[PDB]
Design a protein around this nucleic acid. Sequence first.
RNA 1: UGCUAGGUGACCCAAUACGGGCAUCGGGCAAAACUCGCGUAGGAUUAGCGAGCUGGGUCGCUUUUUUUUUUCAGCGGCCCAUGGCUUAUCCUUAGCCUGUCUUAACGGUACUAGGCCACGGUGGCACUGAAAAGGGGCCACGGUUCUUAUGAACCCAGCAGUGUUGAAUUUUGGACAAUCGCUUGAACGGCGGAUCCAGAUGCUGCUUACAAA
Lengths: 337, 85, 64, 236, 79
Amino acid sequence: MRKRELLNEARALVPEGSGWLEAYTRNISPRQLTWRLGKRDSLAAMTEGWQLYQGKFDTVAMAALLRRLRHAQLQDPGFDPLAAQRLLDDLVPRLRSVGLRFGKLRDITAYLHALAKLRSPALLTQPDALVLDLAVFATRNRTELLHASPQRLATLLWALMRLLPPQLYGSEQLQVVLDRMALASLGRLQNFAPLDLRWAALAFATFGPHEDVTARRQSRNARVIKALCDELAARSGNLALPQPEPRDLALAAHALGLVAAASSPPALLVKAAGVAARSLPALSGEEAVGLVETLAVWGLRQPALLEALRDAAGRWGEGEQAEALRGRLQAAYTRLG
Amino acid sequence: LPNHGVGAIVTRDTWHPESKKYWEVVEVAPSTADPTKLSAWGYQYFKGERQHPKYGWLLKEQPGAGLSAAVLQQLSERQAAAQAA
Amino acid sequence: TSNVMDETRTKRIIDHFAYHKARKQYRASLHNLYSSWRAELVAKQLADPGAQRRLKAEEAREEA
Amino acid sequence: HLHELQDLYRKRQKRMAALRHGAQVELEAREAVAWKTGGRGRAVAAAAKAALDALPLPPPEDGGKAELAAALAADTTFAAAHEALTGLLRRGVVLDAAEHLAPLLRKAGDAGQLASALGVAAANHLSQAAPRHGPLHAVLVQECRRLKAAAPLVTLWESLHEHGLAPEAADAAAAVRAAVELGDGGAAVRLLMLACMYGEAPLAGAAEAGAVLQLLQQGNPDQAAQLRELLPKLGL
Amino acid sequence: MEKRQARNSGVRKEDVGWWDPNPAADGNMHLGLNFDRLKYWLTAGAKPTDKVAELLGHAGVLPKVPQPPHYNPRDPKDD
RNA sequence: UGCUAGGUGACCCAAUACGGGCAUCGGGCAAAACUCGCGUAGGAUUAGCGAGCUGGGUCGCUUUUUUUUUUCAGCGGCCCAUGGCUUAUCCUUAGCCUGUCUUAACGGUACUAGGCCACGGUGGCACUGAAAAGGGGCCACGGUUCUUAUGAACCCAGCAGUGUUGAAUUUUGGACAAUCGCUUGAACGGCGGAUCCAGAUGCUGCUUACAAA
């Protein structure tokens, strides 16, 4: 009988064009909220849901909200980036009041994936202090990090690779996160997906080389790259397990070239040469070009790979980014003769 | 009735006595809400070396001034004299 | 499994541990043998399929 | 780690306060739905057990020292004082050995009452380590000469031998002495054994063991012959 | 034949194998499995039970399994 | 979601030296559950469908979780477009298909084993479980017994066995040894009226005089 009082409480927050107000309950579960945000397509509807239900959102609701923001970014035509940015600013104090007091590693990783998903190509930003503090708060306890999934940890790494400016790779909180995650993942190396190893290699290459404790951190990320890159090298060719994608081995090879260029002949480059030179048109060009830069910095010459990439080098057209690919591949070709 | 006993060394009667197996009980993190299930955090020593940094718990010596080992051996001879009466 | 003795229960614990032992090395050889079998299975149906021959048969039918 | 030791009593003070008012508000709720659905039959399961969870009566904010004064009152008999004191041992209060337990054991009148007071004292040192053995031993030697019991003294030495609690060699001297004026030399030689068993030196037995051998010469010379054999087996 | 079905039901499994435990004049056991789907099912995590594991080990296409941890007098007259 | 193998353990048990349970992760293949394309007994002495009888919008339809990309339904509430079917509805028969028998074949019709569904004396409903109840939970019915009558107990379409009807229907058997299942880390462990062995009993294939080595 108190539906009209409930409706007046709904009217006091959101204007009268919303379908949420008939649907409104005070005693909602977060499960239904994750589905109800999963049912909308327009940024007006998530705004309606936010001013109705700011009080009941835990971290899963924020993660589904950011995915729905990306969904509206690619499907709602009337997108305003300014309204999205002020709403994204409104998302902050709810996180600092709740999710930084009750965030398990699953929820926080899901949010950081959602925010990096928003910043993905097919510019919206959050403060980086919240991103680092979410990173240290999700990993503050060792035990749940021991029971974490490889998909979770490499997803967290891809989030930290996409969200952060390059000046903040030397921040100590990222290094504390990398300390915890290396101390977890080096025991369960063999539970890893090769895609998860690809993102682990890329993120430790991105964050690694950025007084005794810091050089020890660089040496520890050196042992992480050498063991993990040999884990991918063992996982390539061993046909008994799922064969890693040549894109992933190529991009982890580029990570090896990045950490070799920053810190200054593994089997990984040889097997990467094989999986590229058998399957070039499945490879995008720029990852292979970065692998040619890795061949440059190692000084090794992979013959059928380089003639195959010569054939790939002819097969591009003329135009700005494509001519930049041709130019840098020609430059690394002259670097290798 | 409780466990507390921080840092004791005992053995189990079923354990082979020259195999040198004995605990350093770390702490007690108990349930006093539930009285049958208990946990005894342990630095177990086996063959002298530490493994990890029911009925039948058997009371060995407690070194540290207390009741020392060779002192226990002399006094065990004097217990044998006590049943000798 | 045993309690409060030291004569011939060591034999029982010895056979106990050796039985579970040799079961575990059986289990390891079991791994290596099935993994080898999966290696030739995906070696065979990664060796020939996906080739241009299916396109040759298709282009022969379509030229007909 | 060690803060979980302080926080177990801290959080458990919170948890027992929590269980008291939570159990009380459900106990006052099931009585409202007692007569409507015949709810007394399963309601008395709660009305007994949820009160009688780990400690029903609370640890007093005073410490219950006035209730101790009601318990150590010299008009109150030994059984009512004993049940009040054991109920306050179940309430987890650390007690003074001389202020409370010594008037209790002066209120003890027979040997089983002394042994019950020793069980109270052992639980008291159990809660105390959760230790003060000297003046309890002195006033119990006073109760030994008052009320002619020797085996509670050996029971005290065994009760402190079980967990490793060591009284004084002067306490051992008074114990062997009270065994000499009381006159049970079997208890005296077991006292001498238990006083040896802590690693303590054997009590300078040229006087005390001489008094024991004097008692056992006048009483029965066979166990005296056994004693003269056992005397160098301690080294005396 | 998963855990659900009985011994004689209609099963998605193709073969428990050409099998004849009866001794036959010499080389007394049967011809063994037909093949190429046995390795697929045992590859796919379908379990063996105890004696098919013994028979597969005994045929030598799999290694054998030690059965006895201890000895107590078995009664042979139960039948 | 469920199994099996791996890898992990600030855990528990076993260990004159090392393996199990227990928690979590992920590789393998897998079930499950839904959807639609068609098939399907006769009856005009069933001719309109007493109905949301179909569709569109709006919600409710109890989770985010790897890169460019990802998540049913009238099922209920509301409007609404007024249509949807016309062997439509309604009746009564009937588990369905492969089978088996026959026919030369097409067909026509009681079984074998086994595929799937349904049901558990009748009817309604829920817990838990990923999924629901043949000796699990609650209520009402109908039976069967007993009460000092107030009320409780039980439900063989499980096996044997009893009784009616019938022309006719079997032993109140043995056993976990073989499977196969459930379970347990000793123990050729525990259990299974599944099954395997024996009985009675139609059909069949197959022997049969004794003596003596």
